């Protein structure tokens, strides 16, 4: 079965910047490759078609190249209205869908000011507890959470949600949710948010004791 | 001035069924194969299957056999998806598209079907309680379906405010939290209250948030 590949998976660019995509194919497809851009809450949007062939209406700075293997999708020169994820797809024999490039606004790094919340004492009388690590206002988007109760990793217990690039300051900000029984909560001391990203030299942690 | 134009979003029980319609517009009808491709939140993109409108023909994706069947009326210029035995794995925001051989190139607005053994349910609101700039928040949990806004100071406080997108969790609930980052020099004097609003449960929470004694 035919897999298609996308690289890079996140692409900061400028308006005025030349913008260039790639989309890599398993096995050879030979030229039956299309690009889609879309936007939060849209559907996709045909850009091109054979891999190269521009459809109409689509402003000419964007353009496609390749075939076997190989295709690039290039932005001469981006606007605002460009900024958006970009798949690729093959037009043959199960119709399967790269997993999208997104192509946001650049700003300078920005490390997340992180904040770690206790669950309340009302949630507790009910049972659950929910503890919550914020990321504030960062840039790129590339963030890791990682949970430790009493200096152990946390897996399968944990949900993040991001928000949609700030248009004012260029940020993002990420909320991670902890989810424990009252029993489990209360049977451990130390709980730690630690957060990797490039404007952090290393691992960030905020903790409080329970 | 091809318009394909999906009905409203649905919420489903596992085991229940759920079908979909795409009403084409603005061209021959019978001129293009339809098809149908499925996203599931904050992820990519699915293809499903496709079906040929002149004589109903149809083929899907292998992990859809004996669950979807594609069905089309050329008296309406409609094609419809129906997906049986639903699961969570279902949940997802569903196109139908149009064939122009070599791409899609209309799509339709998307139908939105969540799958989830929870009924209509209002939120519990917790305090995210402010431990220079400080942040806090509100914890909008266990609600469904969606969706629910939230609001700080009545509308009077919207600098800094971030409300993350929903998530389902494995409850099938969905929950979220709002926060806002204020200057830590307000929090004895000015209040903070998150307003959520659930309008499917009529609920309305107004939740003061303020620093946590000991």
């Known amino acids: 079965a035919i897999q298609l590949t996308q690289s890079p998976s996140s692409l900061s660019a400028s308006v005025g910047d030349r913008v260039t995509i790639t989309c890599r194919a398993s096995?050879?497809?030979?030229?039956?490759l299309v690009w889609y851009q879309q936007k939060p809450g849209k559907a996709p949007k045909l850009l091109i078609y054979?891999?190269?062939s521009l459809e109409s209406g689509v402003p000419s700075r964007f353009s496609g190249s390749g075939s076997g293997t190989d295709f690039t999708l290039t932005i001469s020169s981006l606007q605002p209205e460009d900024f958006a994820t970009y798949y690729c797809?093959?037009?043959?024999?199960?119709?399967?869908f790269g997993p999208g490039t997104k192509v946001d606004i650049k700003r300078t790094v920005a490390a997340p000011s992180v904040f770690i919340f206790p669950p309340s004492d009302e949630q507790l009388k009910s049972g659950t507890a929910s503890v919550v690590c914020l990321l504030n206002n960062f840039y790129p988007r590339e963030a890791k959470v990682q949970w430790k109760v009493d200096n152990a990793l946390q897996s399968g217990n944990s949900q993040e949600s991001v928000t949609e690039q700030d248009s004012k300051d260029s940020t993002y900000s990420l909320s991670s949710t902890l989810t424990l029984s009252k029993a489990d909560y209360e049977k451990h001391k130390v709980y730690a948010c630690e957060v990797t990203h490039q404007g952090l030299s290393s691992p960030v942690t905020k903790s409080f004791n329970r | 001035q091809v318009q394909l134009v999906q009905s409203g979003a649905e919420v489903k029980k596992p085991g229940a069924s759920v079908k979909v319609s795409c009403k084409a517009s603005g061209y021959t009808f019978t001129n293009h194969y339809m098809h149908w491709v499925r996203q599931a939140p904050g992820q990519g993109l699915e293809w499903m299957g496709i079906?040929?409108?002149?004589?109903?023909?149809?083929s899907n994706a292998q992990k859809f056999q004996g669950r979807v069947t594609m069905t089309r009326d050329t008296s309406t210029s409609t094609v419809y998806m129906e997906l049986s035995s639903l699961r969570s794995e279902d949940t997802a925001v569903y196109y139908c598209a149009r064939d122009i051989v070599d791409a899609f190139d209309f799509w339709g607005q998307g139908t939105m079907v969540t799958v989830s053994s929870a009924s209509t349910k209002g939120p519990s609101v917790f305090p995210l309680a402010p431990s220079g700039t400080a942040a806090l928040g509100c914890l909008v949990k266990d609600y469904f379906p969606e969706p629910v806004t939230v609001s700080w100071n009545s509308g009077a406080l919207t600098s800094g405010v971030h409300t993350f997108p929903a998530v389902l969790q494995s409850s099938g609930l969905y929950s979220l939290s709002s926060v806002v980052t204020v200057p830590s020099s307000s929090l004895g004097t000015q209040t903070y209250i998150c307003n959520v609003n659930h309008k499917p449960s009529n609920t309305k929470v107004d939740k003061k948030v303020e620093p946590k004694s000991c």
């Open positions: 797809q093959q037009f043959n024999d199960y119709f399967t």
């Open positions: 054979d891999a190269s």
């Open positions: 096995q050879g497809i030979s030229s039956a």
């Open positions: 079906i040929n409108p002149i004589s109903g023909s149809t």
